[PDB]
Design a protein around this ligand. Structure first.
Ligand code: AGS
Ligand code: MG
Length: 279
């Protein structure tokens, strides 16, 4: 209900092109103050609470970093608008599976991973957990700039864990087992998700655990199953994914480590790498 200095007059926005639609509203490209290109997320009336919808803006007010999609402004009166940084190339997932993805090779994909890791290391430093980290929630700008987006589920961590409320449901294939099963969300469950995201990058958008169903993934993963090394992917990178997928969350690497490892990958880890047909 309470407003602050993020508020702007709706008249200062013009919605020009529809970029997407979901069960809770739409995303439009537009112009702000008749001069700035922006993205605008709208709230579909009577689908979600205004206060619930704006929690996402609240999180963004706090998390500011070159590798996170930036909040610009809010319209807190119905219809609710969240005005954010425009990412011209859209979703990483769609980018990877389209024509452009075909031309990408490992050095580029690893740099994209490193940028994402950079954003997440910031999230890590700030004591937040994202909870929805995956290629569909990464946005791509010019020159292969990648930023983490969609902070709807993000929460500030108190007591080392965010415990999910009863009834909450999360996508099994992209979520750490302890979070999906017991509701235990920590930065370490994000690290697990980052590992899944690495498979999305190296397969250029393939679904994780291909062919397997949710209950089977849950079952096999508990038994120790892990996705094998993707085709043409160096084993050292898959080794990194397996580290992200350790059963004990505290044994999973920090994003600080992940960022450094990926930044230095071709010097420290794979000095003699050469590009193949796909990676
Ligand atoms: N800042 C942006 N710049 C460019 N395109 C965007 C932007 N935000 C969203 N889009 C487009 O709209 C799609 C939906 O983005 P999202 O924010 O993930 O929405 P959302 O999935 O409803 O979020 P929730 O809270 O998990 S229901 C993106 O994947 C792009 O195709
Ligand atoms: Mg999403």
């Amino acid at each position: 209900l309470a407003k602050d200095a993020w508020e702007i007059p709706r008249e200062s926005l013009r919605l020009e092109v529809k970029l997407g639609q979901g069960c809770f509203g739409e995303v439009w490209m537009g112009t702000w103050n008749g001069t700035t290109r922006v993205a605008i997320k709208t709230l579909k009336p009577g689908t979600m609470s205004p206060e619930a919808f704006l929690q996402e803006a609240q999180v963004m007010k706090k998390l500011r970093h070159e590798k996170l999609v930036q909040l610009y402004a809010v319209v807190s009166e119905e219809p609710i608008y969240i005005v954010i940084e425009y990412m011209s190339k859209g979703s990483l997932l769609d980018f990877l599976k389209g024509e452009m993805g075909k031309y990408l090779r490992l050095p580029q994909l690893v740099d994209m991973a490193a940028q994402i890791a950079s954003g997440m290391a910031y999230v890590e430093r700030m004591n937040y957990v994202h909870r929805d980290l995956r290629a569909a929630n990464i946005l791509v700008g010019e020159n292969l700039v990648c930023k983490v987006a969609d902070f709807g589920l993000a929460r500030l961590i108190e007591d080392n864990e965010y415990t999910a409320r009863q009834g909450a449901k999360f996508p099994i294939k992209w979520t750490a087992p302890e979070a999906a099963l017991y509701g235990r969300f920590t930065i370490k469950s994000d690290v697990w998700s980052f590992g899944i995201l690495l498979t999305e990058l190296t397969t250029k958008g393939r679904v994780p655990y291909p062919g397997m169903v949710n209950r089977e993934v849950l079952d096999q993963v508990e038994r120790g199953y892990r996705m094998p090394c993707p085709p043409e992917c160096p084993e050292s990178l898959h080794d990194l994914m397996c580290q992200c997928w350790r059963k004990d969350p505290e044994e999973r690497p920090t994003f600080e480590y992940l960022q450094a490892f990926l930044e230095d990958y071709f010097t420290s880890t794979e000095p003699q790498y050469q590009p193949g047909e796909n990676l």
